[PDB]
Symmetry: C3
Subunit: 363 residues, 3 copies
């Protein structure tokens, strides 16, 4: 039976630490610099407490429901509090315990993205109700569909590190919420921490320290850099001069945009995707909930452009056998639509259930 | 003869970097946000300078006296400035040089915990005298007894990553000192950095990237999360609402509390220990020297509960052969008592020697 | 043919992340705390945007020109946008893609050092012109000469991690620029981040997680610590008392000073070099462009003292066969002189070309 590679265990434990770093303190510092000063302490408390909450649900049933074998949409409850996972159980080339932690860290940042923005406007008890509903009925199933052999995986969807599961998912939940900057040095710092953490998010998504981790790494560096220049250029062109928030936003645009693609494309495609994401990001925000705007627009762009740049002819690792580019594009579009709709319905339901129970707006 | 595993070398060099990160800037930023503004620069200077000092003593004689073979209480002086350690010498499954650095990083954070709190009130020259006395006569011997095959090890004490050597040790030295918040975003940031660094502290304590590192990792995530919720819940129950400092304190409570236990217990036990530590932490502080209160109370709780949750029947890795739970508990209690008393006497002696030499209170 | 070691791939991807961390946000936070408050946002924007720029040039032609095989001074254009690098191509014991990223991260921090200081005083378009000229005509060739088998390598120059390529190179470019503190907690934080990142910079320079990485690690800890004490002592002796900025500056002095030496010397030599660098650093600044003063003086000192402490007799790894200490010293001095002069001429040319094109001073 399959044995764990200690190089892969080491790499993926470090990568997990780096993705946890994106939430505590990365996204908290990012939002903390954007939202109103009088609301900062409260937002940091909600982000910390709901981080804790997601860690606990994850171990309790969340991992089992996302990565256990179930149906197209849901796993199982065989792995309650990780029961029936032998300590020496291997998954891929690493101990399954490490897989549990790595996967849970992506749940954390996804919820962090939502809670940092709406903490300002949502009653504390209502944010907790929301997180439970939405993590369970939206993050878990969509993680299952994409990474847990569910519906979208079984149709060949390409999403290396979570254009759909993290970015579009959170953008939508966040925008349904929206519907219902005071310290820029602090914003830069959280962007920097998000950037560094994002190497574990992207490279670690290979599940091993191989050439695919290596390619995801370099593509992360290249797409972020290109998106920064693309945003800044567009800001200089429209606004006369670059801005710090413009630079940071560009960095996030390329990161988001390269997320579904990093392990599939060539550096040339990483560059193109970075430029397009930076401009699309800028275009989008022109039309702190802007954050969901960048994530949504840039994650859509990234997801689509994965179905293009994965092609061998464009420097990519190649589509699966018998899969033309037109097919892959169709599948990317279907994954994106399912994610938008599934997350929105569940977001809507989470917000309504909170509102009926405790009320939504902060008193 | 034993050969180094490059996966283990890589893992443990990264883990060391992460534990150094807990001090520079983690604990400095933590205290910097708590202590009075007019005292911050001075505290950061003392924490930086005494960090340097501990790094130097460690290489000079400290490593040799803690990890050389000696008696029950002290090692030797065979390893002055690491003499007689061949560059290719292996210890466990890593080069001994890496062991030297990893172990020294735990000395650093231990002293950081003490100096950040009392820098406010202690003359600079007096803090330096103190660090030399206490590192040498308390941290070194207790490290030797627990991790260097001394007294407590030879009786089977369980302390995976330093409930006794770091937490209770520093709590006591700190409280003997005490006897003789202005920027909460900064407090959150150092808590976040302590949390991330704490994965190298806990996982790296396996000495290898194996299933025990993996288990220590997951248990770290789970106990911190549970302690956060446990503290916050108790604060909501007693104070009407959660607070940011409450959340951060809870995070530290679970971290401390899971420290002696992380590599020995199951996630179920990690959860229980996290909840208890969060509440005990809150209970303790109710009765910035609060920091030593959490470390002391939570490290005592963690140390005791290791002697319980290590049991195979409760999901743990199992006690040694022929060791009943009652026995392990007795040994945990004896280790805790020896640490409290040994550290206190030496703390007291360090403070008195400083006071007689240069005087203790800042002029 | 040579196969990649996954332990080395993991180690070096993490090390790269750590060196990128030194720039984003390390050096930005360092300068941000030093320069005038009204200039901070602008400096952070320029550091972020030129970081992006260096990442892009690097992938486009920069890597190929530095590490392709060419002549004594320049590589080639065989590796445009990494063309002709097979994804599974190995270099040393890691995938070449990882080598590309690791090497590019050193270009980034080098430019970060220059731009953080002069952003205050240089027109944005002029800093971009400058970076292109200087990275291409100075950083690339000097990287080629030292690490890409060019002139200085072929004569046996010792520079483990970039006393010449990074520190002296940037000091000079920076001082030619100069010729033509408001938040100390923020300065400490960036110093801390530079320190932690510097373990990937120094240890990762072994190209593998072996005993040399291990030695570079420990030597980093020891030289930084010793330089901190050496600076602080000199400040106490001259100024009556230590200061936070004094402590941070000392830390940077030892780091810079041990950079060319870390993988070649013994811990005893690491200690000596640390003390000398801390004092020389202090001496130098006595005679935020001080930053280039420390880097220049301390990098010169470090480079020279590598040619001394590498000796087997002084605990070092040993000079190459047939190389006496006097010879190695001669070669170190020649490398230092070539770097000073090459960088200055190119710096001067970059500043003049910018000035003739867009003008240099901020309007």
């Amino acid at each position: 039976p399959a044995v764990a590679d200690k190089a892969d265990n080491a790499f993926m434990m470090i990568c997990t630490a780096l993705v946890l770093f994106m939430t505590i303190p990365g996204i908290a510092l990012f939002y903390g610099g954007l939202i109103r000063g009088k609301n900062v302490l409260s937002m940091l408390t909600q982000v910390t407490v709901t981080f804790a909450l997601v860690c606990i649900l994850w171990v309790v049933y969340g991992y089992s429901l996302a990565f256990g074998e179930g149906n197209n949409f849901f796993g199982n409850i065989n792995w309650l509090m990780l029961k029936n996972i032998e300590l020496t159980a291997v998954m891929g080339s690493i101990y399954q315990y490490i897989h549990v932690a790595f996967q849970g860290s992506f749940a954390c940042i996804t919820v962090g993205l939502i809670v940092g923005a709406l903490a300002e406007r949502i009653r504390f008890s209502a944010v907790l109700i929301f997180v439970v509903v939405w993590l369970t009925l939206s993050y878990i199933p969509i993680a299952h569909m994409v990474w847990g052999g569910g519906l979208l995986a079984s149709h060949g969807a390409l999403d290396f590190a979570g254009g759909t599961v993290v970015a579009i998912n959170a953008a939508i939940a966040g925008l349904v919420g929206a519907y219902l900057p005071h310290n820029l040095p602090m914003v830069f710092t959280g962007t920097a921490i998000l950037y560094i953490g994002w190497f574990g998010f992207n490279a670690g998504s290979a599940g091993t320290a191989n050439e695919i981790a290596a390619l995801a790494f370099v593509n992360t560096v290249v797409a972020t850099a290109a998106a920064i220049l693309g945003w800044i250029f567009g800001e200089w062109a429209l606004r006369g001069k670059p801005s710090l928030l413009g630079a940071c936003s560009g960095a996030i645009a390329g990161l988001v945009g390269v997320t579904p693609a990093c392990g599939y494309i060539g550096v040339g495609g990483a560059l193109i995707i970075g430029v397009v994401a930076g401009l699309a990001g800028l275009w989008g925000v022109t039309m702190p909930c802007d954050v969901f705007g960048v994530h949504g627009v840039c994650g859509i762009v990234g997801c689509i452009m994965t179905g293009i740049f994965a092609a061998s002819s464009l420097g990519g690792v190649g589509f699966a056998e018998g899969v033309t580019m037109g097919h892959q594009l169709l599948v990317q579009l279907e994954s994106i639509a399912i994610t938008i709709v599934w997350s929105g319905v569940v977001a809507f339901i989470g917000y309504k259930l909170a509102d009926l129970t405790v009320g939504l707006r902060v008193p």
